[PDB]
From a paper:
[name], a Type [name] restriction endonuclease, recognizes and cleaves the seven base pair sequence 5′-CCTCAGC-3′, generating 3-base, 5′-overhangs. [name] is composed of two protein subunits, each containing one catalytic site. Either site can be inactivated by mutation resulting in enzyme variants that nick DNA in a strand-specific manner. Earlier mutagenesis of these residues confirmed their catalytic nature and demonstrated that the site in the R1 subunit cleaves the bottom strand of the target site, while the site in the R2 subunit cleaves the top strand.
Purified samples of wild-type [name], containing a 1:1 ratio of R1 and R2 subunits yielded crystals under acidic conditions (pH 4.5) in the presence of an excess of duplex DNA oligo containing the target site, and 2 mM calcium chloride. However, after derivatization with heavy atom compounds ‘[name]’ or tantalum bromide, the space group was converted to C2221, with only two subunits (one dimer) in the asymmetric unit. We initially calculated MIR phases, built an initial structure, and conducted refinements using datasets corresponding to the latter (heavy-atom) space group, and then subsequently determined the final, higher resolution structure of the native (non-derivatized) protein in the original C222 space group via molecular replacement and phase extension. The resulting electron density maps clearly corresponded to two full-length protein chains, but no density corresponding to DNA was present. In contrast, modeling the electron density as a homodimer comprising two copies of the R2 subunit resulted in satisfactory values for Rwork and Rfree (0.189/0.249, respectively), excellent correlation of the model to experimental electron density, and significantly improved geometric quality. An intervening four-stranded, anti-parallel beta-sheet (residues 116–175) protrudes from this core. This interacts in a domain-swapped manner with its symmetry-mate in the opposing subunit, to form a dimer interface corresponding to an elongated beta-sheet. However, the two sites in the protein dimer are located ∼45 Å apart from one another–too far away from each other to catalyze double-strand cleavage reactions producing a 3-base overhang.
Numbering used by the authors:
A (entry chain A): 7 to 285
B (entry chain B): 7 to 282
Write the structure that this text describes.
């Protein structure tokens, strides 16, 4: 198995909560899930209809399962539903190796690198082997690479830390309220300092944002997948929109573009006379 | 109305340095300059060919005087040479009032607002009349507005400061090296915090190649006008490329769009959503 973020939380949640285990048994969550997974992995191409099909299965599984997580559970809006989308992105980008050339080690939730700072214990350790911190940051989904960072002082053979250098990072939220969109603006800033070529998206199903006023962030795209407000979800009669396959198709197109580009290329700068060729 | 930055630095430099004054007359800098100016003001339209024409005059004037500035002048890349493009932008945007609807006060070099912090002398002045500082930053060229900022205490008239709130800010550099592109990243960050809707450009003639991946954190566009490297200028065979009128045409098009757009809209920014 590649990653399967959702599937694993299913098995972990049922391995720690026996209540939940029976709920998953009784309402056939596990069959629903396996079905979703099977449906998704067999989609081999990535033309628009291919992608639309994945979204189709996504909608189905969410329709089949989310109501159980809402009414039959207790704590399922923390790391049980936010993972359906995480795993979805795993499927969406399962077949990119063959298409972008190389074998990308990271296409799951991951801590994306931000900073390296030095916190030596004392003058001796400073000289001999300075203690350091790498600050990273949880993202719901990262396409990127794994690196080893080592610091050696006079003595040691160096403390090593494993780090993740992201090329795309995606936040995945059921609904996007202002509190969260501030976090995301905030880490976009940091993220762009650390990894200037990391594309950064926030993706939500609903937008729970009070009309307020517009925000210049360093986020490359926000996506509200169901085109709806959150005011609508807990009122008279249900009726949620499907997750819009169009948006996912777009998001896919932009990421693949990104992984296609040489990101510095001064030669093409000089050639054109612009560093930021936006057509 | 119409500011003339280069002309004035010519005028300043010569009242100051009398050696340079003689150099200016001997090599006919003054005639060259006003010719450049004359040529430029009489182009009134702003279609693509119009703009190309201005660039033509630009290239000529640069060709006519830059050599003098290099050879015959002590120190000239400080402001003398950079001011040419500054003034050029003055000509390029001289007819925007009639095109954008409003009478824009500022289209010259200017200090663009950045921050307000409070540094009161003591507890009394804190209450009574707090002392403050406005931090602004020199830009090569700004389209924007003037504003007056007043702070009033408990009892008093309030200290006023004049400030400039830019809509477009353009840096103008002959050549762009890593060291400078960091400065520009650095002030872009500040600038975007202070004035989120201010477009921010760097415009250069030559750009250094091998130097290292730079920080272009929040610069809206860089322009290398001559498409060349900055290491070909002091080699056996000169051969500098003309400033590319295509690029200037672009830059013009981007700025005019910017000034045409509604920027901030407090209560009609829901549809925006997830397009663009």
């Amino acid at each position: 198995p590649l990653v399967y973020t959702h599937g694993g939380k299913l098995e972990r949640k049922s391995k720690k909560d026996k209540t939940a285990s029976k709920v998953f048994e009784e309402f056939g969550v596990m069959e629903a899930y396996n079905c979703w997974k099977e449906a998704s992995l067999c989609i081999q191409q990535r033309d628009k209809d291919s992608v639309l099909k994945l979204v189709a299965a996504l909608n189905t599984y969410k329709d089949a399962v989310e109501p159980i997580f809402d009414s039959r559970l207790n704590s399922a809006q923390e790391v049980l539903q936010p993972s359906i989308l995480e795993e979805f992105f795993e499927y969406l980008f399962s077949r990119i190796d063959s298409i972008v050339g190389v074998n990308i080690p990271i296409r799951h939730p991951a801590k994306g690198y931000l900073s390296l700072s030095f916190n030596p214990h004392n003058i001796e350790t400073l000289i001999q082997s300075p203690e350091y911190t790498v600050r990273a940051k949880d993202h719901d989904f990262i396409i990127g690479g794994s690196a080893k960072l080592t610091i050696q002082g006079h003595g040691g053979e160096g403390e090593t830390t494993n780090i993740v250098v992201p090329a795309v990072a995606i936040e995945c939220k059921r609904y996007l309220e202002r509190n969260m969109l501030d976090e995301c603006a905030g880490t976009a800033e940091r993220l762009k300092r650390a990894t200037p070529y990391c594309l950064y998206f926030v993706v939500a199903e609903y937008l729970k944002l009070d009309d307020g006023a517009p925000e210049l962030t360093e986020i490359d795209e926000i996506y509200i997948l169901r085109h709806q407000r959150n005011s609508e979800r807990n009122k008279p009669g249900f009726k949620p929109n499907p997750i819009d396959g169009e948006l996912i198709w777009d998001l896919y197109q932009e990421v693949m573009n990104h992984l296609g580009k040489i990101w510095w290329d001064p030669n093409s700068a000089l050639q054109r006379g612009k560093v930021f060729n936006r057509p």
